[PDB]
From Swiss-Prot, chain A:
Keyword Nucleotide-binding found: no
Record-given protein name: Kelch repeat and BTB domain-containing protein 2
Record remark: domains: Recognizes the BCR (BTB-CUL3-RBX1) E3 ubiquitin ligase complex substrate, PIK3R1, through the 4 tandem C-terminal Kelch domains.
GO MF entries: ubiquitin-like ligase-substrate adaptor activity
GO annotations of cellular component type: Cul3-RING ubiquitin ligase complex; cytoplasm
Gene that encodes it: KBTBD2
Kelch repeats: 311-359, 360-408, 410-448, 449-485, 491-532
Pathway membership: Protein modification; protein ubiquitination
Protein's UniProt keywords contain Repeat: yes
Family annotation (CDD domains): BACK_KBTBD2, BTB_POZ_KBTBD2_BKLHD1
Assembly information from the UniProt record: Component of the BCR(KBTBD2) E3 ubiquitin ligase complex, at least composed of CUL3, KBTBD2 and RBX1. Interacts (via the BTB domain) with CUL3.
Listed PANTHER family: KELCH-LIKE PROTEIN 22 (PTHR45632:SF5), LD33804P (PTHR45632)
Length: 557, 564
């Protein structure tokens, strides 16, 4: 019928065998003294540059020796190896030079592969360098991705040396963007100052363009501090999602002045049957719920973890049988409301205990008991390296266990025992046991004390990290509880099968005070298996969908 | 790392794009005046001949114009097309010329594909021509396959013009081979006589080699008729598997002489835990059960057919879904005991009523597919053309119907009706209706009478006349009361018979065959099937009549005798 694949792979392997023994070599490429015999047809079919050079009919198609300059020998070898096979060795050490050589040779396949690899490899350490690279080589997709990454973590990357060596257009397009994740304009002002003072003799003429991009007369959230905070309870968030929108974009409050602390509920049951495992985030300050497009592959049984840098991650879980367990790792883009996948895990897990410790995210347990040494395995992920490293596994196989982090130390709790992990020692130490044997309990690290609340019957058990002793505090004022720390205060979001209400606990007085009721106006039944956490998100452009009539039960009579 | 092919499939089509627009043309091949610009690199990777002529470093690698002689321009274009795409578009008209061009250029890929294509193409017309073609080009695989086909139908292909033009070496191995399917030694003698008189001036010196290969003092089966037939009942068959088992191979009876009519049972139960649908045959003369291999590889619910030319085929069926219906079609080899495959059907089928009429095989019924479109699916197959064609469907959709052939007419029967198909008109004509409504019955043909026996079964026997178009009752199968006989009508020794497997209350299966009296309208006890062999075969077994090689098939009864 058409091109047969069975002969195609045989012809390709025969061409490779002929190239290895140097048969029918008609062209000789000279790169910085090194010689490479090759065929003109393969280079023409793979690279359009060689195609145009050979189809011109000039001496280049007649002379056997062609001198190629400004081309690395290793990159040319990788291009030619790929030209005779199809496997691309893309590593983080030589990806930029490979992309440069490909764009100089115009290999569409290699160009696209290197582009997508660089896009899936943008971290918080190379974002600025990759942005400069994309600007120099005019790659719009990589440029936009790196710009978004810089806008997401500007306050963390504006100290790097790559930021002070940026061009003028990059500076004026980064500073003018309203997506700068900064809590104060003073940070952007000091960034511009250090950029202009890095090289004064060449940037003394750009001081006007520098000062014209920093908002000085904005006065975003200081004007509210001048008059008063007099409003309905914590209605400063309404001004955030109101004044910001309607703004000439010159005095606009930057995106960093818009993030609000919201209770992130994932796998929260939804009235809509299609998405019975949806995810919504109720803002305690704005008193409003915001819809999330959280499920990237309509799956569930995934854990939640919020780093101190306010980053959301989900891992583990299983997709419906097209319920096969998977390894995908998803990071949430708080600006685009879309999860970008990462390097999959090494072992499949179901609701893994994900906690952030010393910049690493650890996957603890969260899987059905299979194999003595095969289970209880613990694995951590490197953020910048995008890799998974195995660590000392769990001492014993547990179920429905929780994990917290205090003082850069890992803690996992079980029925009545407790083990503390130290990354510096990579070992497990059994700690003070608990007087009660309970399951399905929720735990949240607050200050120097770990709170263990649950049991499936509620009892507030306080552990001291400094004393290694467990002391009883009280009971949850009531049961489906979710202990979460918000507003620098320990709280418990309890669901009374459904009624919703949040309580505040006093550590000194050992008393639980009513903090705020969550009227059934919105926040419908979220089920019982939903995972909860605390994080700051931009309500400005997250999602807007009430979905719930705040009034019902007509009283006309 | 792992070599990807998304780049190979793109590099290949990019090379074709340059070949069509004639870029990088470094060599021009001249064949009978026609020019064919191509690349020296591509021809070397496909053909080892060009690889040798280009890597020699001589003027052939430096001169752009190369004159290739004795090469067809049409076949060369196909070879070049294959080198740039990989799809070989072969046909029965230019396969022998393409193989000659391929072997002259020594293309391992084209030669292998053209070799297997010719093997699956050997019919009852090209066998002799392909045999001389294989010897001329020294293809040991095609030569052996073509030779076995000549030995199978030697009595039907020795009249072709290709047989008298065979070489001397091609004759000495055919006549000396003991696989000649001939009923009498005179056929081989006359076949050798017509060969030497075809060209006397060039074969007058080979008259001694011709007579030295034909067995004259053999006297295979003319000796048994001389003395007498005095033996246990029809034990002339035990002598067949005895004289041909020990002889100097010069006076051996040829394979054709070694033949026995056996009741072929396909999809029968197995004594040992094995294929639930096994295939075994019973020789009523040798009183021996032979085992048949099943290359179908666990086919289920298949049909059977035996042509008047003693050819066996199976079609349709279902295979266990790794059950799914397929359109497979296999031909049985009477000598190699295999089941070669043949051009599949157009539609998948289950137990089709396969019948042979005027040399054509027809697949009737067979697992109606697409009830909305049509249910009465039927199609014919040309053995020589190896092609399937749709024909006039049945007038109505029925189930568990039978099909027979009488006087070159295709008769299909149903619950109470019967339709006659005429291939000369390609239409269906309703015939006389049956008086009793019966299903799952057996059908048979003998002389001018069609027998629709069995069915609900019962012992009722219906005799239909083609010349009178009338259905009438004649007699009832004499069986024991309260028994459950699953009968199968079979015609053997030019006489209608019924292979009746009787299973009684608390008793094992009993097999027995009776003979019907046409003039007296009676059923006579013909032969009791020994229970020391022929173990239980179930009820869904298919049966037919055919001749096989007792000399060579697979003699393995095993069934342990003298029990209790």
């Amino acid at each position: 019928r058409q091109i047969n694949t069975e002969y195609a792979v045989s012809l390709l392997e025969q061409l490779k065998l002929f190239y290895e023994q140097q048969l029918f070599t008609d062209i000789v490429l000279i790169v910085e003294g090194t010689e490479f015999p090759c065929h003109k047809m393969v280079l023409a079919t793979c690279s359009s540059y060689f195609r145009a050079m050979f189809m011109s009919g000039l001496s280049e198609s007649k002379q056997t020796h062609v001198h190629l300059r400004n081309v690395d020998a290793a990159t040319l070898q990788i291009i030619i190896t790929y030209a005779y096979t199809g496997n691309l060795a893309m590593n983080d050490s030589t990806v930029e030079q490979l992309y440069e050589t490909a764009c100089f040779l115009q290999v569409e396949d290699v160009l696209q592969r290197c582009r997508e690899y660089l896009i899936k490899k943008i971290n918080a350490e190379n974002c600025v360098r990759l942005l400069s690279f994309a600007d120099l080589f005019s790659c719009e997709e990589l440029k936009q991705s790196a710009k978004r990454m810089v806008e997401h973590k500007f306050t963390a990357v504006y100290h790097q040396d790559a930021f002070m060596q940026l061009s003028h257009d990059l500076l004026i397009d980064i500073l003018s963007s309203d997506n700068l994740n900064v809590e104060k304009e003073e940070t952007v002002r000091e960034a511009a100052m250090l950029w202009l003072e890095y090289n004064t003799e060449s940037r003394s003429q750009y001081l006007s363009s520098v000062l014209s991009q920093i908002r000085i007369d904005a006065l975003s959230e200081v004007t509210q501090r001048a008059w008063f905070q007099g409003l309905p309870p914590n209605d400063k968030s309404v001004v955030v999602q109101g004044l910001y929108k309607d703004m000439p974009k010159f005095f606009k409050p930057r995106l960093g002045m818009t993030k609000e602390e919201m209770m992130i509920f994932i796998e929260a049951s939804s009235e809509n049957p299609c998405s019975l495992y949806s995810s919504v985030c109720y803002s305690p300050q704005a008193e409003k719920v915001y819809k999330l497009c959280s499920p990237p592959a309509d799956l569930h049984k995934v854990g939640t973890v919020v780093t101190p840098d306010n980053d959301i991650y989900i891992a583990g879980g299983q997709v419906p049988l097209k319920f096969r367990t998977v390894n995908c790792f998803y990071w949430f883009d708080a600006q685009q409301n879309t999860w970008f996948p990462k390097t999959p895990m090494l072992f499949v897990r179901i609701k893994p205990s994900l906690v952030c410790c010393e910049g690493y995210i650890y996957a603890i347990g969260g899987d059905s008991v299979g194999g003595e040494l095969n289970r209880r395995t613990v694995e951590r992920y490197d953020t910048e390296k995008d890799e998974w490293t195995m660590v000392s596994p769990l001492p014993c196989a547990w179920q429905w266990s929780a994990a917290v982090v205090v003082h850069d130390c890992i803690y996992v709790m079980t029925l009545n025992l407790m083990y503390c992990y130290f990354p510096r020692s990579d070992s497990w130490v059994e700690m003070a046991m608990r007087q009660t044997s309970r399951s399905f309990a929720s735990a949240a690290a607050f200050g120097d004390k770990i709170f263990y609340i649950g049991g499936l019957s509620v009892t507030v058990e306080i552990y001291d990290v400094n004393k290694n002793e467990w002391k009883m505090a009280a009971n949850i004022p009531a049961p489906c509880v979710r202990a979460v720390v918000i507003s620098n205060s320990l709280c418990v979001f309890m669901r009374e099968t459904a009624k919703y209400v949040t309580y505040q606990y006093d550590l000194e007085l050992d008393r639980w005070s009513l903090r705020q009721h969550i009227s059934e106006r919105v926040l419908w039944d979220l089920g019982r298996d939903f995972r909860c956490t605390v994080g700051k998100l931009y309500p400005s452009c997250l999602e807007e969908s009430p979905w719930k009539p705040p009034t019902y039960l007509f009283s006309t009579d």
